[PDB]
Amino acid sequence: KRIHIGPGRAFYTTXP
Amino acid sequence: DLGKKLLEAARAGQDDEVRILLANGADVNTADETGFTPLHLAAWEGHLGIVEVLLKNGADVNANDERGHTPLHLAAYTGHLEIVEVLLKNGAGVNATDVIGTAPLHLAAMWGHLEIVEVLLKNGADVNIQDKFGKTAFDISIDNGNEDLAEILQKLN
C-alpha cells in the first residue's frame, strides 16, 4: 500500500 | 477566511502572523479539505515556535487528518525531534495509529530518526504494534537495512 502523509505529495509504503 | 490565513501562516513559519490571527479570533483548530490543522502544518514544516503558540492557544494535539495522521505522526515522519518532544509533553498519543495501523514509531523508524525513536520509546511507544501487514518498527528498520536502529528496537523474547 501507498499511504500519503503530510500536506504535499509524500507517501510511505508498507506491504503493497 | 481567518482559518485559511492561519493555516498558511503556520505552514510558512510566520510566528508573528500566527499570533495576530489567533488574537483576531482565528479558529486554532480550523481544518482544510485534507483535515490538516495549523498544528499539523507546523509540525510537518518543523516550526517549533508555532507549535508552542498553537498548543498554548488551545490546539487539538491529537487532531486526525483524513488519513488518521496526528501532528505527532507528521513530526515523527519529518524528523522534527523538538516538536515530537513538545507534542508528547502536551499529551500527544504516542501509540496513535493511522488508518492502516501505522504509529509514529514506525514513521520515525522508517527514516532512521534515531533520537526520535528513543524519545517515543521513553514516552511509552509500544514496539510490538504492527500495521495491517504485520510490520513492527523493528521490522521496518530491518527492511530498510538500518543496523543501529534495529538494536534499539530489538525484542529478545
b/e map B139-157, b = 16+ CB within 10 Å: bbbbeeebeebbebbeeee
Instruction: Read off φ and ψ for residue A4, nearest 5 degrees.
Output: -65, 145
Tell me which residue in A1, A7, A10 faces B100 most closely, judged by beta carbons. Answer: A1
| Count of alpha carbons within 13 angstroms of residue B113, beta-carbon side | 25
Residue A2, chain B, CB below 8 Å: the answer is no
- List strand residue ranges (DSSP E) for B6-146, in order: none
Structural domain range at position B157: 1-157
Question: In angstroms, rounded to a whole number, what is the distance separating the alpha carbons of residues B43 and B150?
Answer: 26
* Interface with A, mutate which of B47, B100, B141, B142 (most A CBs under 10 A): B100
d(CA B15, CA B83): 15
Domain tally, chain B? 1
- The answer, for A5 touching chain B at a CB cutoff of 8 Å, is yes
CA B9 → CA B29, B51, B75, distances in Å? Answer: 14, 12, 18
| Solved with | X-ray
Residues B84/A16, Cβ–Cβ less than 8 Å: no
Q: How many residues does chain A have?
A: 16
Identify whether the C-beta of residue B25 lies closer than 8 Å to the C-beta of residue B2: yes
What is the rounded CA–CA span in Å between residue B17 and residue B26? Answer: 11
Nearest to B131 among A6, A7, A14 (CB): A14
CA distance B55 to B86: 9
Give me the amino acid identity at B127. V
Which residue has cell 515556535?
B49
Integer angstrom CA distances of residue B40 from A14, B37, B136, B139, B150:
22, 5, 24, 27, 29
